[PDB]
């Protein structure tokens, strides 16, 4: 809000003794705006309490490994059909979930090709659902150039644009990434972890060179490896009804002694 906002008046308080109320009141004149109420956050005209400043700490800076950890986490759950389906993406009829494709797809220079591809791969019904979501936004962002809203679609990770990013462009829903420049804002939109992507074999090879396997450095991010796991056996149902453990448990007291 502007600096001068509210203070461009010259207004003194009629002190006590005049009845009225000790506010600074507009000085002199034969207008409506005379002996009014200036400056106070409560007055009409007035001046907002704690006017907003530009030097509010807008930007927010995050540790680099943590950023990478998130981006690994999103990738890891771009596998897992459950996490992709739960994130909404109609991935029912898709052939294999870390969906990787031939690298002619770098070639394509026309939406025609890019859509045909998506229909063969059965990824179109996500795009279809994007069209279905296209609707008007609720409220004031309508009058501030955020008027329409819709779904996020299939990600498409490419290794090099040989034409591709032109091809997939008008197809609403699609975002294109380079592998070498991935982004958590796009791999986990809403801060929500799953997301159906579509890999290019050239790009899908490059992932291990970028992120490093568990027994090999990144070899592309100088000093980095994957984050180690805290617990390895995630399925505790496989643990808890093992021989080794159930051997060593007292028998479950389960009678219900009511009052």
């Amino acid at each position: 809000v502007s600096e001068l906002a509210g203070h461009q008046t010259s207004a003194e308080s009629w002190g006590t003794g005049r009845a009225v109320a000790r506010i600074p009141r507009v000085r002199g004149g034969g207008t409506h705006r005379s002996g009014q109420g200036a400056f106070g956050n409560m007055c009409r005209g007035g001046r907002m309490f704690a006017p907003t400043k530009t030097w509010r700490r807008w930007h927010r800076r995050v540790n680099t490994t943590q950023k990478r950890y998130a981006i690994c986490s999103a990738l890891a759950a771009s596998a897992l059909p459950a996490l992709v389906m739960s994130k909404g993406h109609r991935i029912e009829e898709v052939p294999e979930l870390p969906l990787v494709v031939e690298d002619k797809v770098e070639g394509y220079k026309k939406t025609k090709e890019a859509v045909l591809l998506l229909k063969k791969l059965k990824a179109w019904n996500d795009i279809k659902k994007v069209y279905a979501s296209q609707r008007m936004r609720a409220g004031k962002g309508k009058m501030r150039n955020r008027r329409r809203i819709q779904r996020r679609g299939p990600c498409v990770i490419y290794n090099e644009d040989n034409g591709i990013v032109k091809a997939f462009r008008n197809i609403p829903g699609i975002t294109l990434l380079n592998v070498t420049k991935l982004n958590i804002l796009k791999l986990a939109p809403g801060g929500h972890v799953g997301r159906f992507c579509i890999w290019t074999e050239s790009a899908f090879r490059k992932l291990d060179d970028l992120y490093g396997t568990w027994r090999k450095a990144a070899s592309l991010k100088s000093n980095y490896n994957l984050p180690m796991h805290k617990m390895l056996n995630t399925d505790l149902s496989r643990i808890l009804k093992s021989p080794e453990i159930q051997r060593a448990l007292r028998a479950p007291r389960k009678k219900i002694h009511r009052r």
Binding site: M143, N145, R147, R169
Partner: protein, 134 residues
């Protein structure tokens, strides 16, 4: 999307641009499609509508297959008046009802020299793009 970083995509800016548009610019805004018949012949989608073209109204109340001659172009009001597109006021007097140019179709153009040269310029650019696409 639009990628040109000197265009606007800003409701307030586009509307202000529109409503406070100058006559010669309004000419372009007030354009209207050719009939499929002419679309075939001239290789042109649409043309800036003019004082005495022949025209169908396509949508609204006056939507109909009659071919009325244009009567005048009220560029201030973003509208054109058409021959029998009119309504009787309280006291019997006919009043030319406005139709917006874009909800109308030009069946017959009023061809002058300049209109002829315009159509030659638009058709040529269309065929350049088809040659570039091929």
């Amino acid at each position: 999307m639009k990628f040109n970083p000197f265009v606007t995509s800003d409701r307030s800016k586009n509307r202000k641009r529109h409503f406070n548009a100058p006559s010669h610019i309004r000419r372009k805004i007030m354009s209207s499609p050719l009939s499929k018949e002419l679309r075939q012949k001239y290789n042109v989608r649409s043309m800036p509508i003019r004082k005495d073209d022949e025209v169908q109204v396509v949508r609204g109340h006056y939507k109909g297959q009659q071919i009325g001659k244009v009567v005048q172009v009220y560029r201030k009001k973003y509208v054109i008046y058409i021959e029998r597109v009119q309504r009787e006021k309280a006291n019997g007097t006919t009043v030319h009802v406005g139709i917006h140019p874009s909800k109308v179709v030009i069946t017959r153009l009023k061809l002058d020299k300049d209109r002829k040269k315009i159509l030659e310029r638009k058709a040529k650019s269309r065929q350049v793009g088809k040659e570039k696409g091929k």
